[PDB]
């Protein structure tokens, strides 16, 4: 401690004065730091927040300058522990509030799935969401993310359950690695299936042993890995989506009265599926708000009937359960002795199944599993697993979303194409029917136009795909009886169908791909040259070196805002400061006017 | 090294004609364009290979009696009677026929697989010819632009 | 105000200096923005 260049002799002797000397000349540094560091850390963080507030408010004071050099000598330890937010409220001015950030919160934020959720939120809030619901979506994302961080941190009856929990946690932790291994095994199976031949009798001929049994080995391994992937997903991401839906339906019940006063429509299947379990037993299982039932009861009980509310919301004959629990409640209760199973609520379980079977990703993994099962029957069904790279990469997802994007325009252009092909078909069927003789020697003429449906199909199957119309494959007229009419027909066909409509669908898909790529680049450039919270711009902060960088990484950090919301939630109110209590009241009343809309600390002060 | 190799075989001096591409400006622009959207080009080519492979396996299972590339024979030159040969024939003819793959193999002309064969061929000419090949074309043209 | 040498003018009129100048202009207006523009310009002046 005297040679590590971080202590002078006075400090070294002051620190040896704190020794224990347990009669053998030995100190236990373990208990030393377990006893002498935690309160020191807490009060040091408090005084560091005080000094940082004083610094960021009153600059350029030599006495405060030495105070600040000592302050930063201390802050070199509390830099990753203090966070700052710019609130706008209760004073008509920007206020820099400070708070504590937990190492656990930092780790759970550094977790991968949290980063994936963050990038997805950024993308779908800059693409679709504007500025009226931007803060709404951001606060919803913060809530979903703190729930996801809690889940990631969480990641005879006492012998099987404690092991199945560990197994599910391991699967949820290695879900992504399971996906990569599944992709690699699928590529291997497809390579082996490429090394193939036929004799009516399928055999893998191109190799000499060591390749037939490994195919079945990799097939059963891929099936096992697909089952492991779906099991890990069901315990890693299903909690998040069911929590989102529970929060949505609970807030619709509380604020809007979706199933009390403004009953949903008949086409919205989501409304009906939520009405299915607005009255279940354990309705808020993941929203951590087990009192939305009593809240909506107290809100809509004196107008629509308290008994009616209690029967439509579940928990019948328990309108006095609150008073019974407030006055001489029961201490506890054993689970059961004869009812080991069926304790769960079948209604809520069916609701969970119905919400996971329309997740658009659980469905993808289910299709993956069924394709593996079918590949066990016929090995060539493992080729469908090669499409996993299209969903794994970015620009491939862009191509797929492009071919899906202009869906209605594509379908209607294809319909118009079919209609012009049908019109050209009927004119060729009436007039130019002696020219559709597809034979070289015969002598049996293979007339493709001597039937309406066959002629229409020959048209839609040759004339659309000949690249030069339809006349370049059937016989040339070469006779002054229908020459001019036949040529005008063929040139009009090659004009409207080949170089116009086919080109229209081509350009439709190409422009959809270009638009999707261009929106992605615009989202990237907006995140790179514009602030998310305030959105003042980049040239304003491009005055001091790294100005915009420090502004977006210190003052208006989305991670800092999320950590501040987590701190307010875990703050144990009646201990909030003025600004913290104000922000908490705004968050409870769902107003979000405390975000800096068109101002920042630099724009407000010097 | 190309000059040294041209001393061995004189035709290696043809590689020196590419010096104008680096000497001029718009030619360097064309080369930097074909290099620019590199990852997007590679991944679009991979997706192209994948759809060609899927169309290959469906043609290999169902429409294998139509790949008879002969005029007189009498020995049938079946190009689809092997998986790798069928995939290669696909990636080598159906991508570059300009009108799909059905415009070079025999017409079904029979009410047994006619509708399925035509839907297969029109979907091929749609996805591979006038969509994905067009996507790579537009990628390079837009990089140049 | 300052003095400019005829030697400096000639070496600036040299061709490779003009090539380096145009390359710097191109790759400082294309990739470089305004935060590192003066950095790149001073580095170019030293190289030149
Ligand atoms: Ca208080
Ligand atoms: Zn900002």
Swiss-Prot record, chain B:
Output the superkingdom of the source species.
Answer: Eukaryota
What is known about its processing and modification? Answer: Channel activity is modulated by phosphorylation. Phosphorylation is increased in failing heart, leading to calcium leaks and increased cytoplasmic Ca(2+) levels.
Q: In which tissues is it expressed?
A: Highly expressed in heart, lung, cerebellum and brain. Detected at lower levels in adrenal gland, stomach, thymus, esophagus and ovary.
Disulphide bond pairs: none
Mutation: residue 98 to A; reported impact is: Reduced calcium channel activity. Reduces single channel conductance by 97%. No effect on ryaodine binding
Compartments where located: Sarcoplasmic reticulum membrane
Q: What is the effect of changing residue 102 to A?
A: No effect on calcium channel activity. Abolishes ryanodine binding
What is reported when this gene is inactivated? Answer: Embryonically lethal. Embryos die at about 10 dpc, due to defects in heart tube development. Cardiac myotubes display enlarged rough endoplasmic reticulum and cytoplasmic vesicles that contain high levels of Ca(2+).
- Which residues, if any, are the signal sequence? none
Which ranges does the record mark as transmembrane? 4-24, 43-63, 124-144
Identify the segments that dip into the membrane without traversing it: 94-103
The record's similarity note reads: Belongs to the ryanodine receptor (TC 1.A.3.1) family. RYR2 subfamily.
Its domain description in UniProt is: The calcium release channel activity resides in the C-terminal region while the remaining part of the protein resides in the cytoplasm.
How is the subunit organization of this protein annotated in UniProt? Homotetramer. Can also form heterotetramers with RYR1 and RYR3. Interacts with CALM and S100A1; these interactions regulate channel activity. Identified in a complex composed of RYR2, FKBP1B, PKA catalytic subunit, PRKAR2A, AKAP6, and the protein phosphatases PP2A and PP1. Interacts directly with FKBP1B, PKA, PP1 and PP2A. Interacts with FKBP1A and FKBP1B; these interactions may stabilize the channel in its closed state and prevent Ca(2+) leaks. Interacts with SELENON. Identified in a complex, composed of FSD2, CMYA5 and RYR2.
Q: What is the role of this chain?
A: Cytosolic calcium-activated calcium channel that mediates the release of Ca(2+) from the sarcoplasmic reticulum into the cytosol and thereby plays a key role in triggering cardiac muscle contraction. Aberrant channel activation can lead to cardiac arrhythmia. In cardiac myocytes, calcium release is triggered by increased Ca(2+) cytosolic levels due to activation of the L-type calcium channel CACNA1C. The calcium channel activity is modulated by formation of heterotetramers with RYR3. Required for cellular calcium ion homeostasis. Required for embryonic heart development.
- Name of the featured protein: Ryanodine receptor 2
Please give the organism.
Mus musculus (Mouse)
Q: Which gene encodes it?
A: Ryr2
Instruction: Give the residues of the full protein shown.
Output: 4726 to 4870 of 4966
Swiss-Prot record, chain C:
Organism placement in taxonomy: Eukaryota, Metazoa, Chordata, Craniata, Vertebrata
**Domain note:** The calcium release channel activity resides in the C-terminal region while the remaining part of the protein resides in the cytoplasm.
Q: What family name appears in the similarity comment?
A: Belongs to the ryanodine receptor (TC 1.A.3.1) family. RYR2 subfamily.
User: What protein does this entry describe?
Assistant: Ryanodine receptor 2
Q: In which tissues is it expressed?
A: Highly expressed in heart, lung, cerebellum and brain. Detected at lower levels in adrenal gland, stomach, thymus, esophagus and ovary.
Quaternary context: Homotetramer. Can also form heterotetramers with RYR1 and RYR3. Interacts with CALM and S100A1; these interactions regulate channel activity. Identified in a complex composed of RYR2, FKBP1B, PKA catalytic subunit, PRKAR2A, AKAP6, and the protein phosphatases PP2A and PP1. Interacts directly with FKBP1B, PKA, PP1 and PP2A. Interacts with FKBP1A and FKBP1B; these interactions may stabilize the channel in its closed state and prevent Ca(2+) leaks. Interacts with SELENON. Identified in a complex, composed of FSD2, CMYA5 and RYR2.
Its PTM note reads: Channel activity is modulated by phosphorylation. Phosphorylation is increased in failing heart, leading to calcium leaks and increased cytoplasmic Ca(2+) levels.
UniProt subcellular location: Sarcoplasmic reticulum membrane
| Protein task | Cytosolic calcium-activated calcium channel that mediates the release of Ca(2+) from the sarcoplasmic reticulum into the cytosol and thereby plays a key role in triggering cardiac muscle contraction. Aberrant channel activation can lead to cardiac arrhythmia. In cardiac myocytes, calcium release is triggered by increased Ca(2+) cytosolic levels due to activation of the L-type calcium channel CACNA1C. The calcium channel activity is modulated by formation of heterotetramers with RYR3. Required for cellular calcium ion homeostasis. Required for embryonic heart development.
Report which superkingdom the organism of origin falls in.
Eukaryota
Originating species: Mus musculus (Mouse)
**Effect of knocking it out?**
Embryonically lethal. Embryos die at about 10 dpc, due to defects in heart tube development. Cardiac myotubes display enlarged rough endoplasmic reticulum and cytoplasmic vesicles that contain high levels of Ca(2+).
């Amino acid at each position: 401690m005297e040679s590590h260049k971080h202590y002078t002799q006075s400090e070294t002797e002051f620190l040896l004065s704190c020794a224990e000397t347990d009669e053998n000349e030995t100190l236990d540094y373990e208990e030393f730091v377990k006893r002498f560091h935690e309160p020191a850390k807490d009060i040091g963080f408090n005084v560091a927040v005080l000094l940082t507030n004083l610094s960021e408010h009153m600059p350029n004071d030599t006495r405060l300058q030495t105070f600040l050099e000592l302050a930063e000598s201390v802050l070199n330890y509390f830099q990753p522990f203090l966070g700052r937010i710019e609130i706008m409220g209760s004073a008509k001015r920007i206020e820099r509030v400070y708070f504590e950030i937990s190492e656990s919160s930092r780790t759970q934020w550094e977790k991968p799935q949290v980063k994936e959720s963050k990038r997805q939120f950024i993308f779908d809030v800059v693409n679709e969401g504007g500025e009226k619901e931007k803060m709404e979506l951001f606060v919803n994302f913060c809530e979903d993310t703190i729930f996801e961080m809690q889940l990631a941190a969480q990641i005879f009856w006492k012998k099987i359950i404690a092991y199945q929990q560990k197994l599910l946690n391991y699967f949820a932790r290695n879900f992504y690695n399971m996906r990569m291994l599944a992709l690699f095994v699928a590529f291997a199976i497809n390579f082996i299936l490429l090394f193939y031949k036929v004799s009516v009798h399928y055999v893998l001929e191109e190799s000499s042993g060591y390749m037939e049994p490994t195919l079945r080995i990799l097939a059963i391994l891929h099936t096992i890995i697909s089952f492991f992937c779906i099991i890990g997903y069901y315990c890693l991401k299903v909690p998040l989506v069911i929590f989102k839906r529970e929060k949505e339906v609970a807030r619709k019940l509380e604020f809007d009265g979706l199933y009390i006063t403004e009953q949903p429509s008949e086409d919205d299947i989501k409304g009906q599926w939520d009405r299915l379990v607005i009255n279940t037993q354990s309705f808020p299982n993941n929203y951590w708000d087990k009192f939305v039932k009593r809240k909506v009861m107290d809100k809509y009980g004196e107008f629509y009937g308290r008994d009616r509310i209690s029967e439509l919301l579940g928990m019948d004959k328990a309108a006095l359960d609150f008073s019974d629990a407030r006055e001489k409640k029961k201490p506890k209760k054993d689970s059961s002795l004869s009812a080991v199973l069926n304790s769960i609520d079948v209604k809520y379980q069916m609701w969970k199944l119905g919400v996971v079977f329309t997740d658009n990703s659980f469905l993808y993994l289910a299709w993956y599993m069924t394709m593996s099962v079918l590949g066990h029957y016929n090995n060539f069904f493992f080729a469908a697993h090669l499409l996993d790279i299209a969903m794994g990469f970015k620009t491939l997802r862009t191509i797929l979303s492009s071919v899906t994007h202009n869906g209605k325009q594509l379908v209607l252009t294809v319909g118009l194409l079919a209609v012009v092909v049908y019109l050209y078909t009927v004119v060729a069927f009436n007039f130019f029917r002696k020219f559709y003789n597809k034979s070289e020697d015969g002598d049996t003429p293979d007339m493709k136009c001597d039937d309406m449906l066959t002629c229409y199909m020959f048209h839609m199957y040759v004339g659309v795909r000949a690249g030069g119309g339809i006349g370049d494959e059937i016989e040339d007229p070469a006779g002054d009886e229908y020459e001019i009419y036949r040529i005008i027909f063929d040139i009009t066909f090659f004009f409207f169908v080949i170089v116009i409509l086919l080109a229209i669908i081509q350009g439709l898909i190409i422009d959809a791909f270009g638009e999707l790529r261009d929106q992605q680049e615009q989202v990237k450039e907006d995140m790179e040259t514009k602030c998310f919270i305030c959105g003042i711009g980049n040239d304003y902060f491009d005055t001091v070196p790294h100005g915009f960088e420090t502004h977006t990484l210190q003052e208006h950090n989305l991670a800092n805002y999320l950590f501040f919301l987590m701190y307010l939630i875990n703050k144990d109110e009646t201990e909030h400061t003025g600004q913290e209590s104000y922000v908490w009241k705004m968050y409870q009343e769902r107003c979000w006017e405390f975000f800096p809309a068109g101002d920042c600390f630099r724009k407000q002060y010097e």
